[PDB]
Design a protein around this ligand. Structure first.
Ligand SMILES: COc1cc(N2CCN(C(C)C)CC2)ccc1Nc1nc(Nc2cccc(F)c2C(N)=O)c2cc[nH]c2n1
Length: 297
């Protein structure tokens, strides 16, 4: 790692509270002073790497930040700055003020003690979420990333309820092996060919996308609840897939069934999902999407 214009002074960052454990260590909510032009102060998420990490891991932490330097998508959580001089090393992100998509959906259940007094997501809101997630994933696919970790908990929710992909889903290649499958990669979100032969492609991400939609419409229940990890592996490898949540919108169901095609070739691409959903989204969508951008080539 070598510093550049992404270097941000430590003293600019004030930390406010722990948000939770990220893949590398504790993530914090904070404030950053003069980190974006036209803004005195910016609400940030600050990633850290925890004490127990090897030097190799510490370098891997910064390399992840390095990769996000080349991402400018409204529907992927963006990097704001890096504090690399001295320890602790800090990776500064746009804050996603409504948390991960899984916890956000759980807050919307009838029986949630942390319920914001708002109704569960409308069909309209759900479709918007889908196109947003799909647009972020399309960007990553164009950048040549296979995510491998698409799940509601890995997607974030902004202040204005925009949903973004938290990261490019960076995993060491070893976690793709049969030992770890049957590990950091979640078997309840995995395509049958990934489960079978460790094939991870943009098509297997589409399968995981379908599970996200299932999480959206079940308000983040656990996929295949009542089955063990061994039972899911077989069930899914034999041609099985999730039942539709009670009174799930038919439009979302049709989207999930497209994703859960056994033959990867028969599944949609992320651009195709955005295309399928594009004609009834928020008027701001074309202005911010990768789909409608000059970069979508
Ligand atoms: C207030 O903002 C948040 C609240 C919660 N709440 C979660 C629900 N909690 C309940 C269970 C107590 C309260 C905190 C969770 C996340 C955010 N915002 C946020 N988090 C990020 N990363 C993570 C935070 C915690 C755990 C994680 F695994 C991650 C991660 N996957 O990286 C980022 C990264 C960029 N921007 C981010 N913004």
């Amino acid at each position: 790692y070598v510093p550049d214009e992404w270097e941000v002074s430590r003293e600019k960052i004030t930390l406010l509270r722990e948000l939770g454990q990220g893949s590398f260590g504790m993530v914090y909510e904070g404030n950053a002073r003069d980190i974006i032009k036209g803004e005195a102060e910016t609400r940030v998420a600050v990633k850290t790497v925890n004490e127990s990490a090897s030097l190799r891991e510490r370098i891997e932490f910064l390399n992840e930040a390095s990769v996000m330097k080349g991402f400018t998508c409204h529907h992927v959580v963006r990097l704001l700055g890096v504090v690399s001089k001295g320890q602790p090393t800090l990776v500064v992100m746009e804050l996603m003020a409504h948390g991960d998509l899984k916890s956000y959906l759980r807050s919307l259940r009838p029986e949630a003690e942390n319920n914001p007094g708002r109704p569960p997501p409308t069909l309209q809101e759900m479709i918007q979420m889908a196109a947003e997630i799909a647009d972020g994933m399309a960007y990553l696919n164009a950048k040549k990333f296979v995510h491998r970790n698409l799940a509601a908990r890995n997607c974030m929710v902004a202040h204005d309820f925009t949903v973004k992909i938290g990261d490019f889903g960076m995993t060491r290649d070893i976690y793709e092996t049969d030992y770890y499958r049957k590990g950091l990669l979640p078997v309840r979100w995995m395509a049958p060919e990934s489960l079978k032969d460790g094939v991870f492609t943009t098509s297997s991400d589409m399968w995981s996308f379908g599970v996200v939609l299932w999480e959206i419409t079940s308000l983040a229940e656990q996929p295949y609840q009542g089955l063990s990890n061994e039972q899911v592996l077989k069930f899914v490898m034999d041609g099985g897939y999730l039942d539709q949540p009670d009174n799930c919108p038919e439009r979302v169901t049709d989207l999930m069934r497209m994703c859960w095609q056994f033959n990867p070739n028969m599944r949609p691409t992320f651009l195709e999902i955005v295309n399928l959903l594009k004609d009834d989204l928020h008027p701001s969508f074309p202005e911010v999407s990768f789909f409608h951008s000059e970069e979508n080539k």
